[PDB]
Every structure is written in C-alpha cells, then in structure tokens.
Design a protein around this nucleic acid. Structure first.
Lengths: 154, 118, 225
RNA sequence: GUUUUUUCACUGACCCGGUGAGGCGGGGGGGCGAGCCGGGCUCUCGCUUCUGGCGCCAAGCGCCCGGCCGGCCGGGCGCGAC
RNA sequence: CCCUCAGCCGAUCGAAAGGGAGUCGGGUUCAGAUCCCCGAAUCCGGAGUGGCGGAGAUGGGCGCCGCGAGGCGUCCAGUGCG
C-alpha cells in the first residue's frame, strides 16, 4: 500500500539486556549490515537521525518530526525531501521548506533522518493497463473505479 | 527503600479464607446417578444375543448422563464381573447403548443366564 | 596472602557503553490517579493566591509552646466510656445504702461558649477537611476577647478526648493549683494571635512559583548584569 | 490601596505529543579552554564512529554480625552508581 | 505468613476446507466399521516411599605384601569420546 521501502534497524536497550527493533523509512543508500547513529552528538551522513537545530543550512533531510517527540511526520513518501533554510538559536525555531513549497517553522530540537527517501521517481513509468491500477489500489483501499458524477442520477 | 522501575504495581494484599457462620444448604445432595439408576436394562435383540455369543460382550441401554468409567464400575458392582472395555453410542431414540466387553475370566453367555436374558 | 586471581573490573556507565545500573526512580514513577491528585492539590495551594481567612491556619503554634499547652490540656481530659462506669460503681454507698473542669469538645459547643464569654483559651486544629466549619472562630474569639491558638493535628487534639479527630478544644475552667500554667500560656498566645489580628487579616498566602520557573527568572535577571 | 484604562510574558486550569511516565531543573568533589600571582573565581563539555562480534542478574574497597573450640563456617550495610 | 524475584500490554469468542503429536493390513453384518474381531504398530500424560540394564565412571602417581596376577592401607584427577 506504500511506495518507499522500510528498514528493520536493531538497537540495544541502554537499561536492560533486551534488544529493540524499529521500522524506519529507508533513505536512498541505506544497505543491510550498515550502522546508523541516532541522537544529538551523532555525525551528519545519510541514515543518521539528529535534530534540525544541530545541522547546517541546506541539509536535505526526510522523515522530519513536526512536534518534538512525535516520531516523524513530514517528508516520508517515496523520493521526497524537506530542506533546512535557516536557524534562530535564541527562541530555538528553524525554517524548513517542504515537498509542496510551504516553508514551516518547527521547534529546532525535533529529529530527521539525513538524505532523500528511497524508491524515487516511481510516478514516471505509465500504468498503461487498468489492471495495474486495480492491483495498485487493492493493496490500499476501496477507491479506484471513479464513477464521474455527471453520468449518475440527480 | 528504592524504586528501580517507573511503574506503580498494586501491592499484594492478604485475602482471607471463608469460615462461614452457617452452611448455605442444610444437607449434601444425595447422588442420583447411582449403580441401579445408571444401568436401565439389557438389550435382548437378535444383534445383542449374537454379539453376546460371538464377541463376549453384553449390550445394555445406559442412562444418557453416564461416562464409560461409571458404566465399568456399575456392571462390576451389579454383576460381580470384570470388563475389558466399554464402547457407548447415543441412539436416534435419545438413549445411550453401552457395549460392555468382559475380560476373558468371565463368559458373556454364562452371565446372560444368571441376570436373566436368553 | 594477596591472591593474584582477584581482579578489578571497571563498568563505564557512559552513553552507548554499558547497561545502566538499578538507581532510584522515585521521581519518574507513573503514580496512581489518587496520589497524583493529592500531590498537585498541595501544589495548587502554593501556586494560587490564597485569601487571609483560609491562609491564617498556616501560621500554627510553635513546638515549645504546643508541648507546654498539651501538658496542661492532658490533666483536664473528658472521662473514657469505661472511666464513666466506675463513677457509677461509686453511687450506691449513699443511694442503695461538684463536677470537674474538662475540655469542651466539638465546634458547636465551643462556638456557643465563645459568644457567651465562657472560654479562657480556644485551641483550633489547622487541618479541618472542609474549612468552612472553622474559618470564622479566629474572628469570633478576637471580637469576643477570647485568647486562641492554632495547633497542628486534629488527630493529636482528638487524642486529648478519646475519639479520632476533634476540630476545636476550649478551656472553660481549671483548678486553683493549675491557675498559673494557664496564666503563662494566655500571656504568650494572646500576644501572638489576638493582637496581630489587623496584621493577619491583610496577609495573602500562596503565590509562590515552581523552583525551575523561579530558577529561569533568576537566570534572566543575571543575564542583564 | 480598590477598580477603570494599552502592549510584552507568566503557569496553574484547559489542549496536544511521547514513553514500560528511566536520568528533569538547580548546585557540587570532578575535566578542557577564559584570568589574577599554592589562593578563590564567569562560561564550554559529562567518558561509545575504522569491521553484518560480546555486553544483565557487580568487581574492588570499608565497618560490624551466630556457632564450635585472642586460631576453626557464611551473611547484612554504604561508597562503587554525588 | 513474611521476606527476595516477575514487562510484552489486554477478559472472552471467531474455521467440521487455514494452523494442529499419534492406525494401519486381513476378516466380519440384512443394515456399522481405519470404530467390532484378529494381527502388527504408535502419540501424549503419569509413577507413592522411585522397576531393570547402559551412561556418567572408575585413571594416574605411589609404598609394602608378593613367583606375577593381584590385594592392602595412603595422595592427585574425572559435568563422555572421535
């Protein structure tokens, strides 16, 4: 029902001898066996999670939180990116340009994975056959064969 | 006195035993699925007498509530017998029929006469 | 004597290194809904702007005086329900063959002998559960010229009588040899409560912010110096 | 003083998100750089980025605790982890 | 009893075609058979003071008595081998 591939990333719990597994939205370049580093003091290369207040202007990020601790809402469809415009170190507000063109202000301590989302440019290939459209929408919801209103009765 | 978990679990309170001031019911219910109540009557059919003389098993019509275990205790108590196995089927009459095969120390035909089926 | 197989093992409990120890989390526990209620009821009473009629019950009598007061109060108890019967054992020696001073208990039967000029000192508990029961007795005792003190613990003041809790306890009378102890109490209590009454009436309690809201203000204050 | 009479911001009702409500806000022995001649001071960090391993249920240091016969066996409490 | 220890985190229902250990050959009736009979197996559960073998597990270094086995007291190892 979704375009972009996921990624099962295994961390180890800092508090008990468990092991936690989180489903991420894969950036283009994430591979299996790769280490990813999440949090404030983590470095700035693709797959890492770090707050938008602790990275330069023009940093192309994806899967960006809109309220701090909501686990990422903006720019997570296949091949999307919400680029950083500028900071405001006092009051702690960072401008971000979104996939539409809207430039929203967010609370600067909220996190995003670096790089653009995987499975990009998939709206280029033509469906061609009504059957492919059927097989697409059968994974999502009951919405496909759109009956236009003008043919219908009053 | 250290809280090592961020959760509050309900403390395990004591729960006493019942020591009731009077028994609810005066007398215990005297059992109604007893030895005589459980075995109604033997079948005396062509099939049943053929089963008696060829397979060494009696055929009884048994009270529909009864287990195989209760049948196997009942026939042992009511006929001074020993049983190999009991096999029950509920008939389309709504009554049970229990094929009680005897262990080889006893003959079905020897027992059929003394209980009074022939 | 020094065994060379015994070896020191360091646990580096820094981030992303070692499984953290079992430390005290009494601060970050998700408490039951009732504990959370009674706690941030005590927080409301510190944040909100509390009126002097209610707030005056937080100016409570000092430990030194309260001990001297309960030592005097302990001699003029009402009799226990079992103490009453041995007084009725001592009836028949004239019948079948002059009453002492106690503490007047309860609010109605102390209120009726503050208005009547029949209370020498009135003791009030600081912690009455609905406060409307007791709010006025400061005003009454002051206006009628009764010396009054406020003690901590209605449970303590109810253990003077032989019940659980008792909001108000009055001294109606005392004996000839225990006049002096009551006299030196009323001196140091009437100078404390009844004579500070124009001061008490204009004194709003509460209106104290949280320690980290205060600590944010103090940071902002030294940021312009 | 008790209102009336305008902009900035306060938390405490009320709202949203998160979590197994696990380290919040001050200060402090502690560590790098700021500066006066061992002395006391304003700020910056709080221990892991070379690999498709391993990581819990304590090591160590300090004080007492029942017997048996100042010499004969195993337990509790702190710091470790302000 | 009282001390020490315990996350999955949702009661309960929902399939005679999904998941789901283990029975097959011969004979037998007017009408039933993988069910009765005969003969070969087999899966799960249990055993009260634990029912029998086999495994653990019976080396190595000694010192006397000894014709040598081999015995007798000592002192070390053994939670299986290729």
């Amino acid at each position: 029902g979704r375009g972009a591939p996921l990624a099962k990333v295994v961390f180890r719990d800092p508090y008990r001898f468990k092991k936690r597994t989180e489903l991420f939205i894969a950036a283009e370049g994430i591979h299996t066996g790769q280490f990813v580093y999440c949090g404030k003091k983590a470095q700035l290369n693709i797959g890492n999670v770090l707050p938008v207040g602790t990275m330069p202007e023009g940093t192309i990020v994806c899967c960006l939180e809109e309220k701090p601790g909501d686990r990422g809402k903006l720019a997570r469809a296949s091949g999307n990116y919400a680029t950083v415009i500028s900071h405001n170190p006092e009051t702690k507000k960072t401008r971000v340009k979104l996939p539409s063109g809207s430039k929203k202000v967010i609370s600067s301590a909220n996190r995003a994975v670096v790089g653009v989302v995987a499975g990009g440019g998939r709206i280029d290939k033509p469906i061609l056959k009504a059957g492919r459209a059927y097989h697409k929408y059968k994974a999502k919801r009951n919405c496909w064969p759109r009956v236009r209103g003008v043919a219908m009765n009053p | 006195k250290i809280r090592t978990s961020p959760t509050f679990r309900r403390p395990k309170t004591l729960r006493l035993r019942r020591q009731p001031k009077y028994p609810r019911k005066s007398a215990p219910r005297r059992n109604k699925l007893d030895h005589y109540a459980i075995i109604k009557f033997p079948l005396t059919t062509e099939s049943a007498m053929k089963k008696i003389e060829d397979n060494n098993t009696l055929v009884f019509i048994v009270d529909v509530k009864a287990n195989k275990h209760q049948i196997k205790q009942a026939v042992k108590k009511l006929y001074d017998i020993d049983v190999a196995k009991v096999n029950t089927l509920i008939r389309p009459d709504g009554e049970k029929k229990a094929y009680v095969r005897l262990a080889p120390d006893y003959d079905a035909l020897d027992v059929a006469n003394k209980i009074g089926i022939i | 004597v020094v065994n060379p197989l015994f070896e020191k093992r360091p646990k580096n409990f820094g981030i992303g290194q070692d499984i953290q120890p079992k430390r005290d989390l009494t601060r970050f526990v998700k408490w039951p809904r009732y504990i959370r209620l009674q706690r941030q009821r005590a927080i409301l009473y510190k944040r909100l702007k509390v009126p002097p009629a209610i707030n005056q019950f937080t100016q409570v009598l000092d430990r030194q005086t309260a001990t001297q007061l309960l030592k005097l109060a302990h001699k003029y108890r009402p009799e226990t329900k079992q103490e009453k019967k041995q007084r009725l054992l001592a009836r028949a020696e004239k019948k079948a063959a002059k009453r002492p001073p106690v503490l007047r208990a309860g609010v109605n039967t102390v209120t009726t002998l503050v208005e009547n000029k029949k209370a020498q000192l009135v003791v009030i508990a600081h912690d009455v559960d609905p406060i409307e029961l007791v709010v006025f007795l400061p005003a009454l005792c002051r206006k009628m010229g009764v010396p009054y003190c406020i003690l901590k613990g209605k449970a303590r003041l109810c253990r003077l009588v032989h019940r659980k809790t008792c909001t108000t306890v009055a001294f109606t009378q005392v004996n000839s040899e225990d006049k002096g102890a009551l006299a030196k109490l009323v001196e140091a209590i009437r100078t404390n409560y009844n004579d500070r009454y124009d001061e008490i009436r204009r004194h709003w309690g509460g209106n104290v912010l949280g320690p980290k809201s205060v600590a944010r203000i103090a940071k902002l204050e030294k940021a312009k110096a």
